[PDB]
């Protein structure tokens, strides 16, 4: 999803912008899935070591399956939703190997027919 | 003869007796060879009415060479099940696919559960 | 006179058998498809949804 | 109501009067002329297609009726209204696969 | 909702989070209490439902109501013409009952 | 019993008659409102044993689709009305009862007209049954049994008389259940759960005993996990 | 499905040859009984309720999982046909 | 009796080490498969006690999104690699433990490289924490508490040093659980439930232990209806 940016979207430049926009998200200055210049404050606020941690945090209602977040996958840090990670996990569980499963999917777009 | 207990009167089955498929309904004898009308395979309900028309015609006629005829009405109470189909007034044909228990159906914040679930994709 | 031993014999019989499901207008090759039967309680034949387009049903 | 009236499935009071007797199979009604008329009921009549045609009485003993008023239900009428089906709580949302 | 309040109940937590989710979906105007937010949701014809299997609410509101549904004439069409061995034809030996 | 039991729910009840009962459990640690409400609701709506009409015999008619002279209603209507009959047993060991009803003359036969029995009560004496115009002799017996769940008429197949006609039975005393979880405040933690479940029953079983039975069933089902193999 | 249908398609040129060989294998498995198997010692079909898949619940699966092993050899004309075609049907 | 008691639902267990467990309850009567699976899943994902790295302080770190010279991993990568560190306490008396790490030289720093503490234990000593480029000044400490469930770092804000940084805490030993209920059948009827539980746990507790704790928690919470008020 994507909703709104009523604040200064510039984030690449200021490093206090992490704390400043975390404070803004404490108020209603910027949504959790905000349209930031480089990253959304959701990417900054939540970072997950494993897909299991991300999906378990979704189970606790902290973040939806449609929320972008930084998750450390098997070798990389991906700015994706737990929904896309879960879809990749389903594909990798249905088959045996995951590297092949990771390579035969397109996990950056909606799964249209 | 053991199953003949249902055939109370002469040849005809007694009224109000439940009948299953494969049960004798009218006992007719040929040359002695038994050619008796039985409940067809499938389903059977409750016998309600029997009419017998013989050669002693009050005002009735029969097919030539036929001495008598008997017609039997069997009634059954069909209840909604999986095989059946339902529809609204707007053509949304359907078939009952599963009959869910009351506990696991969607319900309002109040205790009242919904009756039927419709797939939106048909709209 | 049905007994659960009869139903156990039934599930023994069809453990490996298959049956051919057929749609009346058979417009192509996939209008006939084999399947493994699973004993169910009811009147209708339960069909996997994904073959809802292999058959035009 | 027009469908159930125009199709001769229910029973209607031909004249203002009071009902005399109501039973499961016949209704005896004494009109205002003093003439009593008895209406039988096809209690369970097999249709051409195998359904059932029943007339269910809709009046009580000693009940005043009006001209053209309902007396007994048709096969598929609630109270002088075409009733073939049910009213149910429907939720429009995709269940599992059923 | 007046009958709901007469028993002495407000808004369930499940309903609260479903309201927040619907607010993120633009169904209900933001900045309003759950009372008028839920009233606006009702005006759409959508009300909160609970799964019953899980107890958790169905994410997003659902339209529910009363509909008239009739059972259609049910002749031999459904009946199982399923046979194994029966009478055979006379001219040719094709099986027909 | 303070950090984990005083910070754990007191259990209050609010019962009106023996039909409606609210049970409040407050406070619960976050996440256990639904965790307790849902299984209890499912068990209450599923497996609460009760009583309902099982068989009906009429001294006059010979099958289901007949009618009695002098009776306004058809036999189908009679069974439909008898279906909502609500019967309370007073002796738990008692299983099957056979009520008798005899009526004549212009009688609006309600449920109160049943002949009294030693350990049986009717919570709905105003339940309409039949309408006898004149000279109509209505003699019937109804066999009511104690069971669980829902059972079709033909599956049980009770045959006491050659003319007895079995009926469908709904052995569930519980009319409906609705549990609601709300937010409660405690000094140390702001967000806590208060679980209040409301139960409507038919009077055959007071909501409290229904809740106790549901809890007992849930506990005995959890018992199955105790022995692994 | 069936164990290793891709593997089964592996060692046979045409699927129809596969069907012929597996079904013929089922035919001897019926005719001499399931004593004439080549997977006796440890790896047998294992039934769920009991060890019923030891004898003969389904011959087609028996023949297929027989074929996955190397103990089955097939050919167009591998044996002098007349001797075994007359010794097969007479026992 | 196979109607209720001989199917005291067989509870078969398949444990693949201390990480993976499958548990099959079979057969179970209609509707109770979900009724048992769902609360158990909620309990396992919500209330199991466990230990997690609550916070970390490094000597030269000022902000959480800074870069540490001499170490290729940044602060974020360090804390994420710290997240999955699994520690079991030896005695119940422990509430919090502060564990330090002094490391220098062009070497790999792993969980086993932590200074030993008598009353704590590590299930993954070979957990590669980070890499030191050339004499990397690795002077850090981590405060690890015991808790339940999942705690975002923001709200609790447990602080030891002025420049210490909060760490999201994953207390629950279970990595994730999934239950599937599929319609089995008996000799005569098919309306029966087969319950499967698949549990993945970090390794602190075997899945059997977690399930036993879950059922014990549910039973003890049920025992709160015994005393009415």
Swiss-Prot record, chain A:
Domain of life of the source: Bacteria
Cystines in this chain: none
Family recorded in the similarity comment: Belongs to the RNA polymerase beta' chain family.
Subunit structure: The RNAP catalytic core consists of 2 alpha, 1 beta, 1 beta' and 1 omega subunit. When a sigma factor is associated with the core the holoenzyme is formed, which can initiate transcription.
Function: DNA-dependent RNA polymerase catalyzes the transcription of DNA into RNA using the four ribonucleoside triphosphates as substrates.
Name used for this protein in its record: DNA-directed RNA polymerase subunit beta'
Organism (species): Thermus thermophilus (strain ATCC 27634 / DSM 579 / HB8)
From Swiss-Prot, chain E:
Residue numbers of the full-length protein present here: 926 to 1022 of 1119
Species this protein is from: Thermus thermophilus (strain ATCC 27634 / DSM 579 / HB8)
Family under the similarity heading: Belongs to the RNA polymerase beta chain family.
Biological role stated in the UniProt entry: DNA-dependent RNA polymerase catalyzes the transcription of DNA into RNA using the four ribonucleoside triphosphates as substrates.
Signal peptide start and end residues: none
Protein name: DNA-directed RNA polymerase subunit beta
Quaternary structure and interacting proteins, as annotated: The RNAP catalytic core consists of 2 alpha, 1 beta, 1 beta' and 1 omega subunit. When a sigma factor is associated with the core the holoenzyme is formed, which can initiate transcription.
Swiss-Prot record, chains F, H:
Any GO BP: DNA-templated transcription
MF (Gene Ontology): DNA binding; DNA-directed RNA polymerase activity; protein dimerization activity
Entry superkingdom: Bacteria
Keyword Transcription: yes
Reaction(s) the record says it catalyses: RNA(n) + a ribonucleoside 5'-triphosphate = RNA(n+1) + diphosphate
Keyword line: DNA-directed RNA polymerase, Nucleotidyltransferase, Transcription, Transferase
Enzyme's top EC category: transferase
Domain comment as written in the entry: The N-terminal domain is essential for RNAP assembly and basal transcription, whereas the C-terminal domain is involved in interaction with transcriptional regulators and with upstream promoter elements.
Similarity field: Belongs to the RNA polymerase alpha chain family.
The protein, known as: DNA-directed RNA polymerase subunit alpha
Organism: Thermus thermophilus (strain ATCC 27634 / DSM 579 / HB8)
Protein's gene: rpoA
Residue span relative to the full protein: 1 to 229 of 315
Curated annotation (Swiss-Prot), chain G:
Keyword Kinase: no
GO cellular component: DNA-directed RNA polymerase complex
Reaction(s) this enzyme catalyzes, per UniProt: RNA(n) + a ribonucleoside 5'-triphosphate = RNA(n+1) + diphosphate
An example Gene Ontology molecular-function term: DNA binding
EC id: 2.7.7.6
Alphabetical UniProt keywords: DNA-directed RNA polymerase, Nucleotidyltransferase, Transcription, Transferase
InterPro entries per UniProt: DNA-dir_RNA_pol_omega, Pol_omega/Rpo6/RPB6, RPB6/omega-like_sf
HAMAP family reported in the protein's UniProt record: RNApol_bact_RpoZ
NCBIfam families for the chain: rpoZ (TIGR00690)
SUBUNIT field: The RNAP catalytic core consists of 2 alpha, 1 beta, 1 beta' and 1 omega subunit. When a sigma factor is associated with the core the holoenzyme is formed, which can initiate transcription.
Entry function: Promotes RNA polymerase assembly. Latches the N- and C-terminal regions of the beta' subunit thereby facilitating its interaction with the beta and alpha subunits.
Protein family membership: Belongs to the RNA polymerase subunit omega family.
Protein name, UniProt field: DNA-directed RNA polymerase subunit omega
């Amino acid at each position: 999803r994507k909703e709104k940016k009523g604040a200064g979207l510039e984030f690449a430049t200021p490093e206090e912008a992490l704390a400043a926009h975390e404070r803004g998200e404490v108020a209603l200055n910027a949504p959790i899935k905000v349209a930031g210049r480089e990253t959304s404050v959701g990417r900054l606020k939540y970072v997950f070591a494993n897909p299991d941690e991300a999906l378990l945090a979704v189970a606790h209602g902290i973040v939806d399956l449609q929320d972008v977040v930084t998750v450390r996958y098997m070798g990389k840090r991906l700015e994706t939703s737990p929904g896309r990670i879960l879809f990749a996990r389903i594909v990798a569980e249905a088959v045996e190997d995951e590297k092949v499963a990771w390579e035969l999917i397109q996990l950056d777009v909606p799964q249209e027919k | 003869e053991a199953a003949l207990r249902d055939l109370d009167e002469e040849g005809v089955v007694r009224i109000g007796a439940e009948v299953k498929p494969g049960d004798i309904l009218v006992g007719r004898t040929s040359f002695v060879k038994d050619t008796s009308l039985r409940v067809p395979p499938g389903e059977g309900g409750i016998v309600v009415r029997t009419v017998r028309l013989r050669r002693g015609d009050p005002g009735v006629e029969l097919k030539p060479g036929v001495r008598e005829v008997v017609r039997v009405y069997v009634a059954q109470k069909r209840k909604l099940q999986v095989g059946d189909k339902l529809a609204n007034r707007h053509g949304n044909k359907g078939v009952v696919a599963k009959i869910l228990p009351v506990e696991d159906m969607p319900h309002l914040p109040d205790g009242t559960p919904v009756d039927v679930i419709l797939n939106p994709l048909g709209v | 006179d049905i007994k659960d031993e009869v139903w156990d014999a039934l599930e023994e019989v069809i453990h490996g058998k298959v049956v051919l499901l057929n749609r009346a207008p058979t417009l192509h090759r996939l209008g006939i498809q084999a399947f493994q039967p699973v004993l169910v309680e009811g009147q209708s034949i339960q069909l996997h949804p994904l073959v809802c387009e292999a058959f035009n049903a | 109501e027009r469908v159930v009236r125009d199709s001769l499935a229910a029973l209607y009071a031909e004249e203002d009067g009071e009902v005399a007797k109501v039973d499961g199979n016949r209704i005896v009604v004494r009109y205002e002329d003093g003439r009593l008329v008895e209406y039988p009921l096809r209690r369970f009549y097999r249709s051409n297609q195998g359904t059932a045609l029943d007339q269910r009485p809709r009046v009580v003993v000693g009940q005043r009726v009006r001209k053209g008023d309902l007396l007994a239900d048709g096969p598929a009428s609630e109270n002088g209204f075409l009733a073939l089906g049910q009213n149910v709580l429907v939720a429009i949302m995709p269940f599992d696969g059923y | 909702f007046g009958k709901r309040k007469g028993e002495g109940f407000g808004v369930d937590k499940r309903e609260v989070e479903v309201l927040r989710r619907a607010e993120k979906l633009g169904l209900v105007t933001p900045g309003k209490t759950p009372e008028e937010q839920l009233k606006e949701l009702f005006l759409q014809g959508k009300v909160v439902l609970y799964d019953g299997r899980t107890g958790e609410p169905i994410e997003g509101p659902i339209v529910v109501g009363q509909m008239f549904i009739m059972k259609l004439y049910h002749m031999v069409e459904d009946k199982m013409h399923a046979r194994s061995t029966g009478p055979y034809s006379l001219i040719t030996q094709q099986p027909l009952g | 019993m303070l950090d984990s039991k005083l910070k754990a729910p007191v259990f209050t009840v609010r019962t009106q008659g023996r039909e409606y009962g609210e049970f409040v459990l407050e406070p619960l640690e976050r996440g256990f409102g639904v965790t307790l409400g849902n299984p209890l609701r499912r068990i209450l709506l599923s497996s609460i044993p009760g009583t309902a009409v099982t068989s009906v015999y009429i001294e006059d008619v010979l099958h289901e689709f007949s009618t009695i002279p002098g009776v306004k209603e058809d036999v189908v209507e009679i069974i439909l009305n008898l279906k909502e009959l609500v019967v309370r047993f007073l002796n738990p060991s008692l299983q099957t009862v056979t009520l008798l009803l005899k009526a004549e003359g212009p009688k609006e036969v309600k449920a109160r007209d049943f002949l009294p029995v030693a350990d049986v009560e009717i919570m709905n004496p105003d339940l309409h049954i039949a309408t006898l115009e004149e000279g109509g002799r209505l003699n019937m017996e109804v066999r009511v049994d104690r069971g669980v769940g829902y059972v079709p008429a033909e599956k049980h197949g009770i045959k006491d008389r050659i003319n007895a006609i079995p009926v469908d039975a709904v052995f569930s005393p519980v009319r409906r259940v609705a549990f609601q979880v709300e937010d409660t405040r405690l000094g140390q933690r702001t967000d806590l759960d208060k679980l209040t479940l409301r139960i409507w029953t038919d009077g055959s079983v007071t909501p409290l005993e229904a809740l106790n039975q549901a809890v007992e069933i849930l506990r005995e089902h959890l018992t199955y996990f105790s022995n692994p193999q | 499905a069936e164990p290793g249908i891709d593997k089964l398609f592996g060692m046979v040129d045409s699927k129809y040859r596969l069907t012929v060989v597996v079904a013929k294998r089922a035919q001897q498995l019926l005719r001499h009984g399931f004593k004439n198997t080549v997977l006796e010692p440890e790896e047998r079909p294992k039934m769920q309720t009991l060890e019923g898949l030891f004898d003969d619940p389904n011959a087609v699966t028996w023949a297929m999982k027989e074929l996955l092993t190397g103990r089955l050899v097939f050919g167009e004309n591998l044996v002098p046909e007349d001797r075994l075609q007359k010794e097969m049907e007479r026992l």
